[PDB]
């Protein structure tokens, strides 16, 4: 209800903006406008070719770190436990493993944006 009502209000409002944006103005609709653009020229025969890249490794280590961030998210609730000593050691283990993964990423090129 309430929350869902706010989400509905926002999405419909956004859609009205885009509808007025895309419908209200008038265009002559001539062909040569469709020619694509690159700083004065057009993007020749590209802008969809497979992208020979290197920071793929950074992109994937993002996800691998995101899993561990999800793992350590429950911490504020976890600090409210009786056996605080075990929670302390084991959370510290989790952050140490974060740091160790980052360090192995570091020395073995890895997070070093590939060339």
């Amino acid at each position: 209800m309430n929350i869902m009502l706010t989400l509905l209000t926002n999405v419909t409002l956004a859609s009205l903006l885009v509808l007025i944006a895309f419908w209200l103005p008038q265009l002559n609709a001539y062909s040569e406008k469709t020619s694509p653009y690159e700083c004065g020229f057009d993007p020749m025969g590209s802008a969809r070719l497979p992208f020979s890249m290197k920071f793929f490794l950074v992109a994937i280590t993002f996800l691998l770190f995101d899993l561990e961030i999800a793992l350590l998210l429950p911490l504020p609730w976890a600090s409210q436990t009786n056996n605080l000593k075990t929670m302390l050691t084991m959370a510290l283990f989790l952050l140490i493993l974060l740091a160790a993964s980052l360090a192995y990423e570091w020395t073995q090129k890895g997070l070093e944006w590939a060339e």
Binding site: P50, F51, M53, L71, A78, T81, T86, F93, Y104, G110
Partner: protein, 175 residues
Amino acid sequence: MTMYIAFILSTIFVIGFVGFSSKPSPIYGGLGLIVSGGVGCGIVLNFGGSFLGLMVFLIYLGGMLVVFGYTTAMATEMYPEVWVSNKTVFGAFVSGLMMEFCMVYYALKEEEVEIIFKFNGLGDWVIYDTGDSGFFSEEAMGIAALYSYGTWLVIVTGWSLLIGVVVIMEITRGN
């Protein structure tokens, strides 16, 4: 009537999945998964799983982000596919729509659908449980018990994530 929302949240989950699995252009399968996850977050949320719902929201809308990250890198081509390119995808899609529609029609008429297991068409609001929670959310407290009772779980996971970054290093190393 917004009574049936807890039903329809799953229903839009199903047909957003079919188009996601209808083998369309990879980004359109991604869009199907995205709407499926967005509507399934509501399914977990209205059952009380606030933290787990927002958790899957976060991690999964990062996870499909990264699978995009190579879709424009290691999966695009001169002519990317379109959700209307292949003729068979429409047939897959419509076969997605009519099966659960027929089954829910039966579950609305007989309430004893015989497909695979035993199921009743009498909504979902029944299966909830009366009770209370005091001043603590059960879901949050349960996921917090990971650092007190999850002795083995966090250890084996963290070890696996370390091994995962190692293998990700090694396979993509390129000699």
